[PDB]
Design a protein around this nucleic acid. Structure first.
Ligand SMILES: Nc1ncnc2c1ncn2[C@@H]1O[C@H](COP(=O)(O)OP(=O)(O)OP(=O)(O)O)[C@@H](O)[C@H]1O
Ligand SMILES: Nc1ncnc2c1ncn2[C@@H]1O[C@H](COP(=O)(O)OP(=O)(O)OP(=O)(O)O)[C@@H](O)[C@H]1O
Ligand SMILES: [Mg+2]
Ligand SMILES: [Mg+2]
Ligand SMILES: [Zn+2]
Lengths: 649, 190, 204, 175, 437
DNA sequence: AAAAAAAAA
């Protein structure tokens, strides 16, 4: 009754106290007005409030929101709509666009405390309470419009009628259900024609999110919960993306309480109405002093060695492997031509060696440090389901494609273990994809070409238990020559027995295992922790706190921390697109001719593809030093790396 | 007495001793009137009561002497007034009707009860189980009231009007330490 | 630098827990004077370094600010090392005295660790002198009271006690107690406390 | 403040961010090459036992040789989290000497906004400490142990003393 | 009718408030300690109930599903009596208390259950094979009318109600009611599957499965593959959706669960067993007293037993700030002549370990070990089902006849044992799954 | 529509 008015005026006072949201509303209004009629982006009517300030202002209203949002959110959005209706000034409005009546629905950020849960932790006593759930997106539905309010007109009356429809999932508060029957007759019998272009329709999508497999109980499978979100943010993220969804967790449906039940063992239905979504990514922006640090470090003469040594400090040796990984993570630019079709842009690396030589560990490091990557094993995958799958939707009842392993990894990197142990048949999928970076599916009446420009790194062991140096390279590798010719670089690793290197690697590994997590004693095992204190998160240049990166002193040369390297590669992959010159061309052609006509034994045959690989590596090295042109030193270093990878020092 | 941290509070045995060092009434079964025979001539209690004692009459002795005579057939302890159903009923009514004040009870509360129930079993005029249950109910409600009142922990002082010895003893190490920490925080902040 | 010293202090805390969980003086651990003498030799190196630094400072070649800051840093190092060592030693002496006072000042070599060789020799002579002090203390004006007796208040006069070890017959006041193995006595409480503390009796 | 107190000497060893507000040639010999002097405005993680005094001596413009930065432990994020819900927050992850360190910090810097929030913190947690201490078995679910593993190092002695007191009372009562 | 219910409630309340042994009222103190820790439940032992008075136990054993709710509401009445003050006249967030029972009656095998056990209290033992996801149930429903539009409340018990006919007193419909989901109370329910123990299966038969339902605190207590002892009610529920005439599928309502592991694997141990373990650890020859204890029926082998002990203890898991993982287990392979007692050690190692599975390398497959991609026939959706190397996560897996295993099957275990994680990509499912064993 | 087990070539 009057409690609605009291809550509305309390929220109005709160909005009057804090002047940031009014400035945001004025800015969004003026930006929309400017976009209207000046020679495509439109800002949606949504604003985010930090409930920490609300707690600092009124504890009762804060607790009312966090405990029973149903009786508190609608008054807040009504007050926001009234404030917007008072602030705005449009003396000359339109006709169809003025009837939107968007309530300016809200978003939240700040500390939640005991309401920041996990999909497994959700239980009965957390119902009807605003919560934030963390997880990974597993599948999504289709964006289908739904009706809200229909506009009707009759020729005789000249009065436009309107009828409003609300469903269980449309509003927080349960109201009397309304069927979708179109009113076609007036009270006096006048014929009513439905008026499209004046009615209200909003998008609808359903997504499902599951708990992360890493934080799961022993011997238990991950569990999932489903999320409904509409209007704005309707097509954000995708399957295979870490998300934090803030919304209201409520039950819906009779759940067999009526006569429709067949057994007494019936459970209700639970579902969360999402209010906002945030990307976790375990942040992705760069500051001004970050740019200063990047530039001043790139002006150094030895950036490439520092960055190569900065990858996986606990892996002894494999220097050129680290250099190749660095060049691969930020490979060359893609070239397209109106007549030359497509030219491949990235680099692929394949490794083969005897057991226990740190290939899987380096691959896991690449997976951890990459911006986007997917983990895959040869034996536990099937090529048909690795690219696209056909499944039926439960809601619509139709069948739609599901993205495969590497389609999710578009513009990323795919890492495969036990490559040689994979079934031969599935290999054709790779033969399809690595050829033209496009997978075509044609099955059950679906005809579509899916783009997949990912780079693939693989590690396989030779046919014998250990590599035979005295044998032909072809007979040591089980894979056929057709796919081996595509991979740019072939690396062979062996653990030659040598007492000096054995002692060095032994003391290094023993150094690694004597490590203690900071602030934790050695007498007890590693214990799990909770999430961050904030459900949603967010002097210059004089600190160099995490810039230099030399966290501990053990060698004269420098070392940089991983997050700054990720920032560097993010900056480089976007801000720089270099071009090549004739000076590097001379070196490239000269070294190609010298390598091709040396006429000595070599691990792998060469062809015109190797020169294209040299060009791509030269472009990648022109990117690594943040220059817009290719220097001949890049050609020299690429030639040296290729000669090592094909001959050996 | 050091024994680690046993130098700061009283152990329950010390509480039992300090309670049993109190007067009590007794009905002797024998006579020791002097011939008008060994003198008691004790140092920490009046002898004139013990020496000038005649059977089947009221006299006051310390509790431990009463228990020692009760071990033999030389004693008959008289139960106090507050150990009966008609008194505990009005007491529990008083606690129920007054939700903020602790009822008035002797500071030997629950302790004389334990001793009398353990030793003096056959001299009560009321069933033992009923009295034990009513005492348990009293303890229950007083515990509820103490737990409710504990929420206010000022850094200045506090008032607890009618708490017995055991209730104070079992709560001292927590309340004292918390208030001391609060005082330290406030003093370091000024 | 004083981080080595931390390894001592943390270890001492574990010892305190051994004192806390057991609530009984038993199996005191074996000393860690090796790390202590390592700290002593490194702090001797620090002290000689300070003396040489003062030498160049008095020479006039050294800068005053460098000399003063190094002096403060070294003084802090010595202060922290001394603090850690005394924190160790005070707890050691406290537990030593606590176990020494309660066994009538005899140290009970007939039965607690057997050879008490886990203590340093200085700690052993400290224990002997403390036993001497405890024996001396009750020889003054408190000769009629046994200070090292029990501290549980006397609650009953006649108790049942059960023998634990075999012996001969022991003289008492106006009587004799023959400690036949595995027998039960119904005797005075104020006559068998010494035997119970010695461990020859059971089931108070 | 006890010299022979073990908890205090343990807590004095925590590391705080600092800044060399004043340049000193020849320093850093215990951290990097001794012959390389440490330049101005260079940040390290110095322990408290030298940061307290080295930032107050001055030495000589009697500016201190070092300047102490606001540590990340006392940050707006932690204050917001502790004000929102203190009962379910685990301070053991932030630190094991949180309360003694906070007392030292508030003694060094007078800040009338930390004393009341910290006071309400331990006042609110004391009630659940008493609730768990009063619950004696006659073995238990996950909630009590989950709370007990969230406790601060300085709260363990209060919990243990309360538990022993209640256990002794029950042992004497029921014989 | 109401008089008998009041008499039964009074009897149970008198039992709770009057039962004492020596000088302790055990149940009142139990209620206190439960309320202090927010565990609104109470445990009743059969022997105490029988010793107090036999009529109450007779009535409980006669018609359990009708009598138990009276006891479970008497419990909450007593809790409100002895936990809050009248104050001469609030939150009152105390739901109906859960009742848990324990007993020592003769066990009944699963195959022995028949028509005479309907609506009776039975005790039985089995092995858990699958646990369903928890679902919600309504207890306090706020119901709104549409035409007259008044408010009403419905209280629902879980033992053994539909929309009321007509309105409450104009001319409404048959059932003009809707459910107000807000201001409603909900609880949790879970389904479990039980299988007969291998040693009690009759001659030439196969194991039989049974369905159990638990609710509230009893949920999320067991994991698949653990021997358990269950006490509950054997009742029957009809299947309208689902042969024969007047058929009724039976099931079990769980009242009490006992497990050997006691859900120990943070520390749930009390002080007595803790100090016992510490004293055992102070034994200066514990290595030999453990080596002698590994299969005392096998003679001669000593290094094998030492290796088995070392494997059982396990290594120390390590992690690094760089993100790489280090394995924390050791793998022992027995490769020798026949007759040297290799499998008899495998079955004993399976028995000793808290979590273990025993399987043959001959009757096994790559898809039957790591993860099998099943497909629900009803909703027609894909989902992962655990195999045998995921059930043994955090324990030891017993494999014999390792050489008889197929070459194509033997390669899937490489990554699963060198990195302790398995990655699968089938039908669009891209999930990395952890398996440490 | 897609995964997994079995007998015969
Ligand atoms: N240079 C190295 N530095 C540190 N550790 C190393 C090195 N070489 C090998 N190792 C160790 O070898 C072990 C074997 O790991 P892993 O199985 O991932 O290696 P791999 O060579 O990829 O083996 P496989 O071919 O069997 O998959 C790891 O624990 C790793 O730490
Ligand atoms: N050392 C031993 N002490 C006692 N019994 C033994 C010993 N070695 C073998 N046996 C006996 O051998 C019998 C058969 O043993 P079992 O079948 O387990 O042998 P195995 O070596 O595992 O065989 P296989 O290699 O064929 O699988 C058992 O009944 C067992 O009692
Ligand atoms: Mg490997
Ligand atoms: Mg065998
Ligand atoms: Zn009506």
């Amino acid at each position: 009754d009057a409690v609605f008015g009291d809550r509305v005026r309390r929220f109005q006072e709160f909005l009057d106290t804090f002047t940031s949201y009014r400035d945001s509303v004025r800015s969004i209004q003026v930006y929309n007005s400017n976009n209207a009629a000046n020679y495509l982006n439109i800002l949606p009517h949504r604003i985010i409030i930090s409930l920490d300030d609300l707690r600092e202002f009124d504890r009762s209203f804060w607790s009312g929101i966090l405990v029973e949002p149903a009786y508190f959110i609608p008054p807040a959005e009504k007050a926001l709509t009234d404030l917007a209706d008072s602030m705005d000034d449009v003396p000359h409005p339109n006709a169809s666009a003025v009837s939107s009546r968007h309530p300016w629905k809200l978003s939240f950020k700040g500390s939640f405390g005991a309401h920041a849960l996990s999909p497994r932790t959700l239980t009965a006593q957390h119902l009807n309470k605003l919560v934030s759930v963390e997880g990974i997106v597993t599948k999504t539905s289709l964006v289908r419009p739904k009706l809200i309010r229909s506009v009707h007109y009759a020729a005789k009356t000249g009065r436009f009628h309107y009828r409003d429809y609300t469903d269980a999932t449309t509003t927080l508060t349960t109201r009397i259900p309304t069927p979708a029957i179109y009113p076609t007759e007036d009270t006096e019998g006048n014929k009513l024609t439905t008026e499209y272009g004046y009615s209200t329709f909003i998008d609808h999508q359903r997504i499902t999110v599951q708990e992360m497999p890493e934080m799961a109980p022993a011997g238990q499978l991950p569990r999932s919960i489903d999320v409904i979100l509409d209007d704005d943010l309707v097509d954000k993220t995708k399957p295979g993306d870490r998300v934090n969804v803030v919304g209201v967790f409520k039950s819906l449906g009779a759940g067999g309480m009526n006569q429709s039940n067949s057994n007494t063992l019936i459970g209700f239905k639970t579902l969360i109405l999402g209010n906002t979504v945030y990307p976790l990514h375990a942040r992705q922006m760069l500051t001004d002093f970050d740019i200063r640090n990047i530039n001043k470090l790139s002006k150094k003469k030895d950036i490439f060695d520092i960055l190569s040594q900065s990858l996986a400090p606990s892996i002894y040796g494999h220097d050129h492997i680290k250099k190749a990984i660095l060049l691969m993570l930020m490979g060359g630019v893609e070239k397209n031509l109106e007549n030359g079709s497509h030219l491949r842009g990235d680099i692929n690396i394949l490794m083969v060696g005897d057991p226990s030589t740190a290939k899987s560990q380096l691959l896991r490091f690449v997976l951890n440090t990459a911006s986007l990557a997917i983990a895959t094993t040869g034996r536990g995958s099937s090529g048909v389901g690795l690219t696209a799958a056909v499944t039926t939707d439960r809601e619509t009842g139709e069948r739609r494609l599901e993205a495969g392993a590497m389609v999710l990894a578009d513009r990323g990197v795919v890492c495969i273990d036990e490559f040689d142990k994979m079934t031969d048949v599935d290999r054709v999928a790779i033969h399809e994809v690595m050829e033209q970076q496009t997978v075509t599916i044609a099955k059950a009446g679906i005809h579509t070409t899916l783009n997949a420009r990912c780079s693939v790194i693989a590690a396989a062991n030779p046919v014998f238990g250990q590599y035979d140096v005295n044998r032909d390279p072809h007979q040591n590798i089980a894979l056929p020559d057709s796919l081996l010719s595509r991979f740019d670089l072939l690396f062979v690793v062996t653990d030659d027995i040598n007492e000096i290197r054995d002692r060095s690697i032994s003391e290094h590994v023993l150094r690694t295992h004597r490590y203690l997590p900071p602030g934790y004693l050695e007498g007890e095992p590693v214990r799990e922790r909770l999430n961050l204190s904030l459900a949603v998160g967010e002097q210059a240049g004089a600190k160099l706190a995490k810039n230099k990166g030399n966290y501990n002193g053990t060698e004269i040369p420098k070392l940089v921390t991983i997050p700054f390297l990720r920032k560097y590669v993010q900056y480089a992959k976007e801000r720089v697109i270099p071009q090549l010159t004739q000076e590097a061309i001379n070196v490239i052609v000269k070294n190609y001719t010298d390598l091709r006509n040396d006429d000595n034994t070599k691990k792998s045959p060469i062809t015109a593809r190797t020169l294209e690989t040299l060009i791509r590596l030269a472009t990648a090295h022109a990117k690594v030093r943040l220059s817009k042109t290719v220097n001949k030193v890049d050609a020299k270093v690429a030639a040296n790396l290729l000669r090592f990878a094909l001959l050996g020092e | 007495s050091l024994p680690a941290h046993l130098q700061q509070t009283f152990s329950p045995e010390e509480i039992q001793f300090i309670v049993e060092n109190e007067p009590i009434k007794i009905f002797p079964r024998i006579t020791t009137r002097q011939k008008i025979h060994t003198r008691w001539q004790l140092i920490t209690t009046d002898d004139k009561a013990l020496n000038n004692m005649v059977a089947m009459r009221s006299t006051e002795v310390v509790l431990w002497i009463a228990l020692l005579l009760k071990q033999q057939s030389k004693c008959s302890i008289v139960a106090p007034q507050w150990l009966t159903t008609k008194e505990l009923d009005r007491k529990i009514q008083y606690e129920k009707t007054h939700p903020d004040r602790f009822s008035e009870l002797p500071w030997n509360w629950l302790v004389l009860a334990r001793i009398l129930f353990n030793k003096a079993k056959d001299d009560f005029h009321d069933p033992i189980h009923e009295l034990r249950g009513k005492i348990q109910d009293l303890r229950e409600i007083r515990q509820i009231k103490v737990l409710k009142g504990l929420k206010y922990l000022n850094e200045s002082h506090l008032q607890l009007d009618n708490l017995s010895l055991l209730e104070i003893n079992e709560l001292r190490p927590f309340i004292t330490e918390i208030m001391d920490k609060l005082r330290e925080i406030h003093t370091a902040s000024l | 630098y004083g981080d080595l010293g931390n390894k001592l202090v943390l270890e001492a805390k574990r010892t305190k827990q051994l004192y806390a969980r057991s609530n009984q003086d038993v199996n005191l651990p074996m000393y860690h004077e090796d790390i202590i003498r390592n700290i002593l030799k490194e702090v001797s190196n620090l002290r000689k370094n300070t003396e040489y630094l003062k030498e160049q400072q008095q020479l006039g070649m050294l800068d005053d600010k460098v000399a003063k800051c190094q002096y403060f840093v070294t003084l802090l190092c010595m202060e922290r090392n001394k603090r850690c060592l005394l924190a160790y030693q005070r707890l050691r002496t406290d537990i030593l005295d606590s176990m020494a006072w309660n066994n009538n000042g005899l140290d009970l070599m007939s039965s607690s660790q057997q050879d008490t060789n886990n203590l340093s020799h200085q700690e052993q002579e400290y224990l002997k002198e403390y036993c001497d002090l405890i024996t001396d203390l009750k020889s003054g004006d408190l000769v009629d009271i046994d200070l090292s007796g029990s501290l549980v208040p006397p609650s009953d006069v006649f108790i049942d006690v059960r023998v634990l070890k075999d012996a001969g017959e022991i003289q008492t006041e106006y009587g004799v107690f023959n400690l036949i193995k595995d027998s039960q006595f119904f005797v005075r409480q104020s006559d068998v406390e010494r035997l119970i503390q010695q461990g020859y009796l059971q089931k108070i | 403040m006890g010299y022979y107190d073990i908890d205090d000497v343990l807590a004095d060893g925590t590391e705080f961010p600092c800044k060399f507000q004043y340049d000193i040639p020849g320093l850093g010999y215990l951290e990097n090459n001794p012959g390389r002097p440490i330049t101005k405005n260079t940040k390290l993680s110095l322990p408290l036992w030298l940061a307290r005094i080295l930032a107050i001596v001055g030495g000589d413009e009697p500016v201190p040789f070092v300047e102490l930065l606001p540590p990340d432990m006392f940050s707006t994020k932690v204050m917001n989290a502790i004000k929102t819900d203190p009962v379910a927050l685990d301070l053991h992850s932030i630190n094991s000497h949180f309360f003694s360190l906070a007392i030292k910090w508030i003694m060094l810097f007078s800040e009338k906004e930390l004393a009341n929030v910290v006071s309400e913190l331990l006042l609110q947690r004391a009630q659940e400490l008493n609730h768990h201490a009063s619950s004696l078995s006659i073995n238990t679910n996950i909630a009590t142990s989950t709370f007990l593993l969230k406790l601060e190092e300085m709260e363990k002695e209060i919990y243990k003393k309360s538990h022993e007191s209640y256990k002794d009372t029950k042992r004497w009562m029921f014989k | 009718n109401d008089d008998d219910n009041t008499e039964i409630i009074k009897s149970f309340k008198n039992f709770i408030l009057e039962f004492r042994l020596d000088s302790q009222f055990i149940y009142r103190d139990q209620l206190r300690n439960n309320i202090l820790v927010k565990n609104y439940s109470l445990t009743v032992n059969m022997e105490h109930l029988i010793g107090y008075n036999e009529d109450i136990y007779k009535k409980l054993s006669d018609e359990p599903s009708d009598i138990i709710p009276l006891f479970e509401t008497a419990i909450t009445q007593v809790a409100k009596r002895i936990s809050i003050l009248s104050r001469a006249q609030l939150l009152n967030s105390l739901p109906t208390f859960q009742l848990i029972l324990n007993s020592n009656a003769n066990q009944i095998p699963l195959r022995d259950l028949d028509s005479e056990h309907v609506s009776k209290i039975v005790r039985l033992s089995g092995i858990i094979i699958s646990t369903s996801v928890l679902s919600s149930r309504a207890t306090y429903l706020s119901i709104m009318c549409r035409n007259c539009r008044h408010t009403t409340s419905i209280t629902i018990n879980n033992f053994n109600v539909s929309l009321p006919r007509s309105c409450l007193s104009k001319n409404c419909g048959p059932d003009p009611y809707i459910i107000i989901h807000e201001s409603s109370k909900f609880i949790d329910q879970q389904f479990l599957k039980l299988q007969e123990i291998p040693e009690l299966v009759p001659v030439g038969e196969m194991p039989r499965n049974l369905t159990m339902t638990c609710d509230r605190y009893l949920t999320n207590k067991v994991i698949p593959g653990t021997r358990v002892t269950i006490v509950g009610i054997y009742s029957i529920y009809n299947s309208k959706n689902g042969s024969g005439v007047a058929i009724r599928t039976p099931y079990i309502k769980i009242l009490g669960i006992q497990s050997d592991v006691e859900t120990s694997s943070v520390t749930m141990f009390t002080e007595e067993e803790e100090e016992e373990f510490l004293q055992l650890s102070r034994n200066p020859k514990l290595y030999e007293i453990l080596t002698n204890s590994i299969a005392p029926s096998i003679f001669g082998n000593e290094d094998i037993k030492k290796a088995i002990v070392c494997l059982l203890m396990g290594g120390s898991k390590k992690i690094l700030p760089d993100g790489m993982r280090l394995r924390g287990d050791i793998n022992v392979l027995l490769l020798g002549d026949p007759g040297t007692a290799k499998s008899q050690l495998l079955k004993f190692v399976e028995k000793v370990s808290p979590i273990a599975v025993y399987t043959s390398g001959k009757g096994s497959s790559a898809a039957g070990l790591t993860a099998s991609v099943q497909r629900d026939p009803m909703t027609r959706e894909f989902y992962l089902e655990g195999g045998a190397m995921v059930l043994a996560d955090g324990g030891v897996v017993c494999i014999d006849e390792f050489d008889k295993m197929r070459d194509e099957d033997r390669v899937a275990i490489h990554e699963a044992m060198e990195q302790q994680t398995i990655s699968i990509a089938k039908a669009g499912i891209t999930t990395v799954l952890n398996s440490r064993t």
